[PDB]
Amino acid sequence: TVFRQENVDDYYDTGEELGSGQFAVVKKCREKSTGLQYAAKFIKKRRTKSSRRGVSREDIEREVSILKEIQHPNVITLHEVYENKTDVILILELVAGGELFDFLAEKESLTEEEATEFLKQILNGVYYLHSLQIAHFDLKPENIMLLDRNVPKPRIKIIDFGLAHKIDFGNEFKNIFGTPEFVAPEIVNYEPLGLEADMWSIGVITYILLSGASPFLGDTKQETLANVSAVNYEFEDEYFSNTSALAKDFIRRLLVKDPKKRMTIQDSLQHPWIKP
Ligand SMILES: COc1cc(-c2ccc3ncc(-c4cccc([C@@H](O)NCCN(C)C)c4)n3n2)ccc1O
């Protein structure tokens, strides 16, 4: 409730499509008053409760409510919100550098030290979010973007807060959602969820970052899920032959089934691999 009612086209020029999901499309746009470039996320409203072809207003308002709070170098910022008959339109800080892993895939090689420089930025972003009791709940390589890929030290921005939740002290939250490869066993098993689920996903991201292989990815969705639940993974010599003992220890402390024994974001930043 209380989103801008004006025609967004009266205030922005729209450009190329940047990405699209089942119920959303992101496009480049330019604010007319300033000439500054932004991103516009057009979210389809479901409009009727029985419809499966759009997003519930509860979900839309939850994402907007969280984005409104956020101001940090490694997380996307919200500029404006518009609404018309069919869509809610989020005007967001533009991140034009593409996915982190596409950038890395074009490099000649990448040392562990160099890898940890990008990972530290992700850690810094999540540290901010967890400090505000916000769980992202959809951390995966495609939601790790670069602001500008054409600078000496490219900056990471975490995007897509469609699944994000404020962790409420008084009531457990359970749900099954997210991408099988990257979700924690508590999500798979419909158990109580919290900030800890993000740290598991960071462990998966770190594993792929160093090896280019995915730790739990099986030959069917159900097999992937079973791998996750049983924490069935290996540092395959083919992929991890040049990886340090400390890097493996970092990952092992994150890919822990019991959320209460999993390394926290605060502790991950003090781990000797990250803070020598
Ligand atoms: C997709 O959901 C969001 C995207 C963004 C966001 C903000 C600024 C921004 N600049 C560029 C992009 C961008 C560029 C390319 C692709 C995408 C993304 O929508 N692609 C799909 C990501 N995920 C849903 C697989 C997003 N974004 N995306 C922010 C909050 C969101 O909930």
Numbering used by the authors: 2 to 277
Direct quotes from the study:
Death-associated protein kinase 1 (DAPK1) has been associated with N-methyl-d-aspartate (NMDA) receptor-mediated excitotoxicity, and has recently been suggested as a target for the treatment of stroke. DAPK1 has been associated with cell death mediated by apoptosis and has been suggested as a novel target for treatment of stroke because of its involvement in NMDA receptor-mediated excitotoxicity, which is believed to be the major cause of brain damage following a stroke. In particular both kinases harbor a calmodulin-binding sequence and an autoregulatory domain (ARD) next to the catalytic domain and are therefore regulated by calmodulin (or proteins with calmodulin-like domains). There are also notable differences between the two kinases, for example DAPK1 is active only in its non-phosphorylated form, whereas activation of CaMKII is more complex.
We established a high-throughput screening assay for the protein kinase DAPK1 by using a Caliper microfluidics capillary electrophoresis system (Caliper Life Sciences/PerkinElmer) and identified a novel small-molecule imidazo-pyramidazine inhibitor (6) targeting the catalytic domain of DAPK1. Therefore, we verified the inhibitory activity of 6 towards DAPK1 in a different assay: the equilibrium dissociation constant (Kd) of 6 was determined by ITC to be 0.24±0.09 μm, thus verifying that 6 indeed binds DAPK1 at nanomolar concentrations. Finally, we were interested in the binding mode of 6 to DAPK1, and we therefore co-crystallized DAPK1 with 6. All residues were clearly visible in the electron density map, with the exception of the C-terminal residues Lys278 to Ser285, which were disordered in the structure. After initial molecular replacement, electron density corresponding to a bound ligand was immediately visible at the ATP binding pocket, and following several rounds of refinement the structure of 6 was modelled into the electron density with high confidence. The electron density for the dimethylamino-ethylamide moiety of 6 was weak in relation to the aromatic part, most likely due to increased flexibility of this part of the molecule in general, and specifically this moiety extended outwards from the binding pocket and did not interact with DAPK1. In contrast, the heterocyclic part of 6 was relatively planar and slotted into the ATP binding pocket in a manner typical for type I ATP-competitive kinase inhibitors: it formed a key hydrogen bond between the backbone amide of Val96 in the kinase hinge region and N-7 of the imidazo-pyramidazine portion of the ligand. The hydroxylmethoxyphenyl group of 6 occupied back pocket I15 of the ATP-binding site and was held in position by several polar interactions, including hydrogen bonds with the side chain of Lys42 in the kinase N lobe and Glu64 of helix C. In the absence of an inhibitor, the salt-bridge formed between these two residues typically stabilizes the DAPK1 active conformation.
